[PDB]
Design a protein around this motif. Structure first.
Motif, PDB file in Angstrom:
ATOM      1  N   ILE F  67       0.854  -1.199   0.000  1.00  0.00           N
ATOM      2  CA  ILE F  67       0.000   0.000   0.000  1.00  0.00           C
ATOM      3  C   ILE F  67       0.890   1.249   0.000  1.00  0.00           C
ATOM      4  O   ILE F  67       2.079   1.128   0.287  1.00  0.00           O
ATOM      5  CB  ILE F  67      -1.031  -0.029   1.159  1.00  0.00           C
ATOM      6  N   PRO F  68       0.398   2.448  -0.355  1.00  0.00           N
ATOM      7  CA  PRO F  68       1.239   3.614  -0.640  1.00  0.00           C
ATOM      8  C   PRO F  68       2.299   3.925   0.412  1.00  0.00           C
ATOM      9  O   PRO F  68       3.421   4.300   0.079  1.00  0.00           O
ATOM     10  CB  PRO F  68       0.263   4.778  -0.753  1.00  0.00           C
ATOM     11  N   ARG F  69       1.984   3.700   1.687  1.00  0.00           N
ATOM     12  CA  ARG F  69       2.932   3.841   2.789  1.00  0.00           C
ATOM     13  C   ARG F  69       4.223   3.059   2.564  1.00  0.00           C
ATOM     14  O   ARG F  69       5.301   3.595   2.785  1.00  0.00           O
ATOM     15  CB  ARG F  69       2.226   3.390   4.070  1.00  0.00           C
ATOM     16  N   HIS F  70       4.151   1.817   2.107  1.00  0.00           N
ATOM     17  CA  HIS F  70       5.344   1.003   1.890  1.00  0.00           C
ATOM     18  C   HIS F  70       6.219   1.562   0.779  1.00  0.00           C
ATOM     19  O   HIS F  70       7.440   1.544   0.895  1.00  0.00           O
ATOM     20  CB  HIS F  70       4.933  -0.424   1.557  1.00  0.00           C
ATOM     21  N   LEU F  71       5.618   2.122  -0.267  1.00  0.00           N
ATOM     22  CA  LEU F  71       6.379   2.824  -1.291  1.00  0.00           C
ATOM     23  C   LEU F  71       7.056   4.050  -0.692  1.00  0.00           C
ATOM     24  O   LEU F  71       8.243   4.252  -0.919  1.00  0.00           O
ATOM     25  CB  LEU F  71       5.468   3.194  -2.463  1.00  0.00           C
ATOM     26  N   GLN F  72       6.356   4.841   0.122  1.00  0.00           N
ATOM     27  CA  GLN F  72       6.965   6.016   0.742  1.00  0.00           C
ATOM     28  C   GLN F  72       8.131   5.633   1.664  1.00  0.00           C
ATOM     29  O   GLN F  72       9.168   6.285   1.618  1.00  0.00           O
ATOM     30  CB  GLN F  72       5.885   6.835   1.453  1.00  0.00           C
ATOM     31  N   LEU F  73       8.043   4.550   2.443  1.00  0.00           N
ATOM     32  CA  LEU F  73       9.197   4.076   3.223  1.00  0.00           C
ATOM     33  C   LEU F  73      10.363   3.680   2.318  1.00  0.00           C
ATOM     34  O   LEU F  73      11.495   4.081   2.580  1.00  0.00           O
ATOM     35  CB  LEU F  73       8.814   2.890   4.120  1.00  0.00           C
ATOM     36  N   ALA F  74      10.109   2.927   1.251  1.00  0.00           N
ATOM     37  CA  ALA F  74      11.148   2.514   0.318  1.00  0.00           C
ATOM     38  C   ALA F  74      11.830   3.707  -0.353  1.00  0.00           C
ATOM     39  O   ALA F  74      13.056   3.788  -0.378  1.00  0.00           O
ATOM     40  CB  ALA F  74      10.514   1.591  -0.718  1.00  0.00           C
ATOM     41  N   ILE F  75      11.049   4.658  -0.858  1.00  0.00           N
ATOM     42  CA  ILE F  75      11.570   5.824  -1.562  1.00  0.00           C
ATOM     43  C   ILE F  75      12.403   6.709  -0.633  1.00  0.00           C
ATOM     44  O   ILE F  75      13.446   7.203  -1.049  1.00  0.00           O
ATOM     45  CB  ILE F  75      10.408   6.612  -2.190  1.00  0.00           C
ATOM     46  N   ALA F  91       0.390  10.067  -2.835  1.00  0.00           N
ATOM     47  CA  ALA F  91      -0.933  10.174  -2.234  1.00  0.00           C
ATOM     48  C   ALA F  91      -1.072   9.208  -1.049  1.00  0.00           C
ATOM     49  O   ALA F  91      -0.761   8.027  -1.171  1.00  0.00           O
ATOM     50  CB  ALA F  91      -1.985   9.907  -3.310  1.00  0.00           C
ATOM     51  N   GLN F  92      -1.492   9.714   0.107  1.00  0.00           N
ATOM     52  CA  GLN F  92      -1.607   8.989   1.373  1.00  0.00           C
ATOM     53  C   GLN F  92      -0.364   8.175   1.783  1.00  0.00           C
ATOM     54  O   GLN F  92      -0.472   7.207   2.537  1.00  0.00           O
ATOM     55  CB  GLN F  92      -2.935   8.222   1.463  1.00  0.00           C
ATOM     56  N   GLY F  93       0.829   8.570   1.332  1.00  0.00           N
ATOM     57  CA  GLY F  93       2.090   7.948   1.745  1.00  0.00           C
ATOM     58  C   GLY F  93       2.574   8.379   3.131  1.00  0.00           C
ATOM     59  O   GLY F  93       3.319   7.652   3.787  1.00  0.00           O
ATOM     60  N   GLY F  94       2.135   9.540   3.616  1.00  0.00           N
ATOM     61  CA  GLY F  94       2.605  10.113   4.878  1.00  0.00           C
ATOM     62  C   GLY F  94       4.071  10.543   4.810  1.00  0.00           C
ATOM     63  O   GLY F  94       4.573  10.867   3.736  1.00  0.00           O
ATOM     64  N   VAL F  95       4.768  10.534   5.944  1.00  0.00           N
ATOM     65  CA  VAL F  95       6.175  10.953   6.050  1.00  0.00           C
ATOM     66  C   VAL F  95       7.029   9.894   6.741  1.00  0.00           C
ATOM     67  O   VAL F  95       6.514   9.104   7.528  1.00  0.00           O
ATOM     68  CB  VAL F  95       6.253  12.320   6.737  1.00  0.00           C
ATOM     69  N   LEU F  96       8.323   9.838   6.434  1.00  0.00           N
ATOM     70  CA  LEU F  96       9.274   8.913   7.049  1.00  0.00           C
ATOM     71  C   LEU F  96       9.402   9.187   8.559  1.00  0.00           C
ATOM     72  O   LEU F  96       9.728  10.320   8.908  1.00  0.00           O
ATOM     73  CB  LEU F  96      10.618   9.111   6.333  1.00  0.00           C
ATOM     74  N   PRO F  97       9.177   8.215   9.465  1.00  0.00           N
ATOM     75  CA  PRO F  97       9.261   8.439  10.906  1.00  0.00           C
ATOM     76  C   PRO F  97      10.611   9.006  11.327  1.00  0.00           C
ATOM     77  O   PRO F  97      11.658   8.411  11.077  1.00  0.00           O
ATOM     78  CB  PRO F  97       8.986   7.091  11.566  1.00  0.00           C
ATOM     79  N   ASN F  98      10.582  10.184  11.934  1.00  0.00           N
ATOM     80  CA  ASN F  98      11.750  11.009  12.193  1.00  0.00           C
ATOM     81  C   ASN F  98      11.404  12.081  13.235  1.00  0.00           C
ATOM     82  O   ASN F  98      10.961  13.178  12.889  1.00  0.00           O
ATOM     83  CB  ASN F  98      12.189  11.640  10.858  1.00  0.00           C
ATOM     84  N   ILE F  99      11.590  11.770  14.517  1.00  0.00           N
ATOM     85  CA  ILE F  99      11.570  12.779  15.571  1.00  0.00           C
ATOM     86  C   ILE F  99      12.919  13.478  15.523  1.00  0.00           C
ATOM     87  O   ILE F  99      13.940  12.827  15.718  1.00  0.00           O
ATOM     88  CB  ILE F  99      11.329  12.153  16.956  1.00  0.00           C
ATOM     89  N   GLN F 100      12.958  14.776  15.248  1.00  0.00           N
ATOM     90  CA  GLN F 100      14.232  15.489  15.157  1.00  0.00           C
ATOM     91  C   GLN F 100      14.974  15.479  16.508  1.00  0.00           C
ATOM     92  O   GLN F 100      14.348  15.540  17.567  1.00  0.00           O
ATOM     93  CB  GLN F 100      13.974  16.906  14.623  1.00  0.00           C
ATOM     94  N   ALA F 101      16.307  15.415  16.491  1.00  0.00           N
ATOM     95  CA  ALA F 101      17.125  15.533  17.700  1.00  0.00           C
ATOM     96  C   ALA F 101      16.930  16.892  18.400  1.00  0.00           C
ATOM     97  O   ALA F 101      16.268  17.782  17.874  1.00  0.00           O
ATOM     98  CB  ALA F 101      18.586  15.300  17.308  1.00  0.00           C
ATOM     99  N   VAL F 102      17.504  17.078  19.591  1.00  0.00           N
ATOM    100  CA  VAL F 102      17.307  18.251  20.480  1.00  0.00           C
ATOM    101  C   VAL F 102      15.897  18.351  21.067  1.00  0.00           C
ATOM    102  O   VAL F 102      15.747  18.587  22.261  1.00  0.00           O
ATOM    103  CB  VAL F 102      17.733  19.585  19.827  1.00  0.00           C
ATOM    104  N   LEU F 103      14.856  18.104  20.277  1.00  0.00           N
ATOM    105  CA  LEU F 103      13.492  17.916  20.782  1.00  0.00           C
ATOM    106  C   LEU F 103      13.384  16.642  21.632  1.00  0.00           C
ATOM    107  O   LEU F 103      12.615  16.583  22.591  1.00  0.00           O
ATOM    108  CB  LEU F 103      12.523  17.806  19.595  1.00  0.00           C
ATOM    109  N   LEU F 104      14.156  15.622  21.257  1.00  0.00           N
ATOM    110  CA  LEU F 104      14.222  14.315  21.896  1.00  0.00           C
ATOM    111  C   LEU F 104      14.712  14.491  23.353  1.00  0.00           C
ATOM    112  O   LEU F 104      15.780  15.073  23.556  1.00  0.00           O
ATOM    113  CB  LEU F 104      15.157  13.462  21.012  1.00  0.00           C
TER     114      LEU F 104
END
Lengths: 80, 108, 46, 93, 93, 106, 94, 99, 79
Positions: F67-75, F91-104
């Motif tokens: 599903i589109p999410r798996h393409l977005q992870l691969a890309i 479309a409906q791929g979302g974003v790569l999981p990434n909590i930016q540092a310093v906020l962490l």
DNA sequence: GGCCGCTCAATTGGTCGTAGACAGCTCTAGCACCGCTTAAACGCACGTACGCGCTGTCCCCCGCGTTTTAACCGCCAAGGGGATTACTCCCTAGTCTCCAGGCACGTGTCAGATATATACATCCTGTGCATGTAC
DNA sequence: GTACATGCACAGGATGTATATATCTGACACGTGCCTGGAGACTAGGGAGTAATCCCCTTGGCGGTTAAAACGCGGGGGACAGCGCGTACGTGCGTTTAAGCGGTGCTAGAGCTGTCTACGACCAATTGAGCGGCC
């Protein structure tokens, strides 16, 4: 060999001063040489492949201008 | 029977309608180019050429030089909020840059 | 239902966040790489 | 032997039509020749897509009118459309 | 006085227009960067000039955006940490 | 008897359809007999590689339906796809999981 | 009418790459649009490259350079390797 | 389980939840109704395909995510963890997207 | 006015996907200007392709081609 | 010590030569552009049918107004690291030059690769139906 | 625990294909002459280096107010049927543009004359500080 270091500190200093910065921290110079080398690396890698395609030994001003159009950073005056 | 008139002169343009038709047809922008197309396009190139030269002329004349040099072109693009969008990613050879200081640098 | 396993993934990743033991992206096998990726990993090993 | 086929005479005529005293350095002529040739590639390039996206063969005045309406920013679009409509109006009589 | 001769210098290079990088260093740098794309290339003299104008324009454009970054961080002094922001949010790397 | 250009060249991608698309797209008045074979092979390679990475991302997330999410992870993981596809959006791929540092948190 | 598209080839490649795996019609929409975009990109650049040489023909060389211009990095080398393998099969098959 | 919670923790939990999942954040009908206001100012009585108005939403949310993701980076660089309009104006100017 | 329908919670979520740890209260309004001026680009281009086609209805292709022209290509809808 | 008149060592002034670089020819010649054919296929006008999109009535979870409160911003104060600036000494960048060699361009000539006319067959797109995956 | 979405089976029309035909494009080997790479000699403009010092950024500390998180309330977003305005097609048609073959206009190159600015240098005037005369 050494030629990336041949972009003088004053040259990068002037080049930044045209861009309107007031003060340069000294770590900018060695890092900027890296950025400029990356920009020429992309432009030349493209322009050389246009030149190789034409079976031609000489890079002409058109081939670098076409590479700059290919990168969406167009340049006028040098032909085309 | 004979004695021509140029398609530029029939259009009322200084720009070359023949050249533009020849380029549209040989450029592979389509297998067919309708007779109104190069006329209309020649007018558009003429209009944009007139606009950018008129502003270059004013920039040169206000800089007290009677001749356009790339500097007077670059100062005509960047001082117009419309042409600076049209040319938002062009570099002008020997153009330099629009004179500007960020106000936080400006002294005392 | 079995959604307690996905709730446990949230608990594991929060336990690691309360411990502070994570990658710079905050997120938690060569056999599966393409021939191109094997060439890039070989280029990273050189 | 090859020929450079520039716009230089025409842009020179257009300058002489709006600043009759003024000159062009050959460097500024080069810039203008690029600008004309680049806007031509942009407009004709977009006109080709406006044909394919409608599965027409031809490009005609209304394809180029639409290419202009897209490609130019604010006032330059309505000015350029005014110029093109004047030119084809005169040409068709 | 310090920083005043720098601020007077900005006005000098914004009114000026010529190439800021020395020809021979840039000429060698282009050939150096070409070597491992291809051996033995010949460069047309005007091509190196075009490449130089592209580079000086790109670097000026980067420093213009880097100034915005440092000033946003309440510094009049630019730092590598500003260049890493500007080249990131340009989308360049 | 005939054999398709695709199966003759050994591609799964449709060499005949690529030939017509090059001929009828007005990319030129003339198309070389090699060009659509070569182009079909590159479209195939790109499609095989982007799917291999997506399928791996799907199975690594314990699903068998891509599903589109798996393409977005691969890309977005593999930086040469991330440079090629660059600025495009899925479309409906979302974003790569990434909590930016310093906020962490510390 | 006919909605001419890549969907069966994309699926036929997927079953060659991961025989167990399945794919959503939304992902088929993406794969169609992705192939059509890459195709318009490469043929687009090949047409410009032909004009710069004042050639008519899109020969296989025109595609090779358009491919090593548009694709980045080592992905460019692998794509060109697949293309030259493919044309080698085709010209060896007659 | 707890009471009052520790602030910032529910923000980090939200980041994980809204990055892990791909649903449209803007409620559909408010956006479906917004697009028609932007239409009336340039062509009256337009009709929108059911896909197209949603494709505009997928482009908008991909654009706004792809702006807050750079805005965040300006705030972190500016020694803050909180985004502000003075970051958004900057991210735009550095992208070349207006001014 | 339907732009005030882009809710404060929706902009929280839509930014939280972008990974911002903390919002400031001015963002919730100012963001609407950014969304509105982005839509006010793609709609005018999409409507321009639509009027050129002599359509009354804006199709998925009419907006996807606008996004391709804006240099922000959208896959999955149409082609 | 203070005034002024010749000396000869002092600037500031006006007319010549030249070179960059257009500018306007001013040919002049070769090549694209225009005109007037005949032809044929694109796009147009105009029906017709069907998707498809408005505009319509039900409803829960989301939006949102109010409340505390705690952690972050913004402000300020102090101080030492570090960039500027001001010279100083040297060198390598700029230049123009000549060789002298490499190769980009051009032209004559060919053949092989490709357009295209058309007859088959096999591929794959629309439908329908079966069944397991994601939720 | 459920059934909607994919995945497979089938018909059939369109498009991919094999073959023959004709040709013009691109490849090849030839020469012309352009111009780029190397390597040199000299000046002097810019560069590397240093010492001196100012002020900027970094840090640490503080208080205020701003956003978060929780909470209860209730409104409007999400999900189902009816009309008709379009959008895609099919047909018949004629106007439009192509192709083809001429004749002339015009555009580019080359060259020239021409300014004409603009920059040094010389030619010819003058102005002044340098000093002795005088009491």
């Amino acid at each position: 060999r050494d030629n990336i270091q041949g972009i003088t500190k004053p040259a990068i200093r002037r080049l930044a001063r045209r861009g309107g910065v007031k003060r340069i921290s000294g770590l900018i110079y060695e890092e900027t040489r890296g950025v400029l080398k990356v920009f020429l690396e992309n432009v030349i890698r493209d322009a050389v492949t246009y030149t190789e395609h034409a079976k031609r030994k000489t890079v002409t001003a058109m081939d670098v201008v076409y590479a700059l159009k290919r990168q969406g950073r167009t340049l006028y005056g040098f032909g085309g | 029977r004979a004695k021509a008139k140029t398609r530029s002169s029939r259009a009322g343009l200084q720009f070359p309608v023949g050249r533009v038709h020849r380029l549209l047809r040989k450029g592979n922008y389509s297998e067919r180019v309708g007779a109104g197309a190069p006329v209309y396009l020649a007018a558009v190139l003429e209009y944009l050429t007139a606009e950018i030269l008129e502003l270059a002329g004013n920039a040169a004349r206000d800089n007290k030089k009677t001749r356009i040099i790339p500097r007077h072109l670059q100062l005509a693009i960047r001082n117009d909020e419309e042409l600076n969008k049209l040319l938002g990613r062009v570099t002008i050879a020997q153009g330099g840059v629009l004179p500007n200081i960020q106000a936080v640098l400006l002294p005392k | 239902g079995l959604g307690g396993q996905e709730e446990e993934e949230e608990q594991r990743w929060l336990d690691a966040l309360e411990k502070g033991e994570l990658d710079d992206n905050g997120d938690l096998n060569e056999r599966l790489l393409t021939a191109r990726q094997r060439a890039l990993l070989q280029k990273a090993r050189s | 032997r090859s020929r450079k086929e520039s716009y230089s005479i025409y842009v020179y005529k257009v300058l002489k039509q709006v600043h009759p005293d003024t000159g062009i350095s050959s460097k500024a002529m080069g810039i203008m020749n690029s600008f004309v040739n680049d806007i031509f590639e942009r407009i004709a390039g977009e006109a080709s897509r406006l044909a394919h996206y409608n599965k027409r063969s031809t490009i005609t005045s209304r394809e180029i009118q639409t290419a202009v309406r897209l490609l130019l920013p604010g006032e330059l679009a309505k000015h350029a459309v005014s110029e093109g409509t004047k030119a084809v109006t005169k040409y068709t009589s | 006085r310090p920083g005043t001769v720098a601020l007077r210098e900005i006005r000098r290079y914004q009114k000026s227009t010529e190439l800021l990088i020395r020809k021979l260093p840039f000429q060698r740098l282009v050939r150096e960067i070409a070597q491992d794309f291809k051996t033995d290339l010949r460069f047309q003299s005007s091509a190196v000039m075009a490449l130089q104008e592209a580079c000086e324009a790109y670097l000026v454009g980067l420093f213009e955006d880097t100034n915005l970054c440092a000033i946003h961080a309440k510094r009049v002094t630019i730092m590598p940490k500003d260049i890493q922001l500007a080249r990131r949010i340009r989308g360049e790397r």
